[PDB]
């Protein structure tokens, strides 16, 4: 493990630099080495981890979608045989994507989730687990697709259960979890009504709690509530 010779604090330091330089592969590798030091992550460090791998897998997912779209057009009416190259390259990007998700899932299993006792950290990491299974779901086609989907569902649900018990309904992690689980329902689970019910209930419960908030926290929560609003306007 090639970050093994770097100080934990230096990895975190370089992750922040990598973010500034928009060098997100680097950022993710620095944060992976930081996790493998074996210590729990602080709030700020958890944010670095998720921003890094979100950017990395986000480019992969965008590329996969472009290539999957081309490949579907190669299957269509009046479409000239172009060889195995579109499939081949979509598969190469897919396998790369799948390896990033497996790497993130591996960090969470070994051993971030099990050492996360506080609600803010446990919910954060279980939401990540749901998110990275959801990205595997987006590209899965075999039999295993159902099992990937269930695994995403199960992480999101455990996270939902904890967040409802332990966090205010304006909490930005709770809000973002609900948003993403609703996206899961709409885009993965073929459950748009659940997606809409969850987004609306989450939005309405946060609205009723905003009065408890300082001006800065109000800003943090209403940003994500707007994202719920955006999906509901898209979905209805």
């Amino acid at each position: 493990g090639a970050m093994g010779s770097m100080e934990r604090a230096s990895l975190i330091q370089k992750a922040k630099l990598a973010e500034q330089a928009e060098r997100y592969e680097d950022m993710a590798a620095f944060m992976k080495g930081a996790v493998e030091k074996g210590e729990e992550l602080s709030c700020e460090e958890r944010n670095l981890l998720s921003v890094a791998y979100k950017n990395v897998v986000g480019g992969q997912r965008a590329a996969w979608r472009v290539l999957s779209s081309i490949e579907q057009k190669s299957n269509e009416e009046g479409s000239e045989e172009k060889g195995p190259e579109v499939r081949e390259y979509r598969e190469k990007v897919e396998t790369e994507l799948q390896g990033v998700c497996d790497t993130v899932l591996g960090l969470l299993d070994s051993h971030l989730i099990k050492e996360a006792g506080d609600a803010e950290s446990r919910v954060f990491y279980l939401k990540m687990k749901g998110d990275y299974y959801r990205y595997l779901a987006e590209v899965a086609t075999g039999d295993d697709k159902k099992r990937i989907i269930d695994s995403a569902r199960s992480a999101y649900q455990e996270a939902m259960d904890i967040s409802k018990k332990e966090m205010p309904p304006t909490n930005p992690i709770r809000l973002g979890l609900a948003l993403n689980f609703s996206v899961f329902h709409y885009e993965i689970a073929n459950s748009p009504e659940e997606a809409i019910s969850l987004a609306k209930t989450t939005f309405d419960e946060a609205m009723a709690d905003l009065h408890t908030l300082s001006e800065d926290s109000y800003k943090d929560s209403t940003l994500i509530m707007q994202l719920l609003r955006d999906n509901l306007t898209l979905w209805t």
């Binding site: 921003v51 979100k54 930005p172 973002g176 800065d216 994202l227």
Partner: peptide, 6 residues
């Protein structure tokens, strides 16, 4: 979807 809380 949404993922770095202030």
């Amino acid at each position: 979807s949404f993922x770095x809380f202030k």
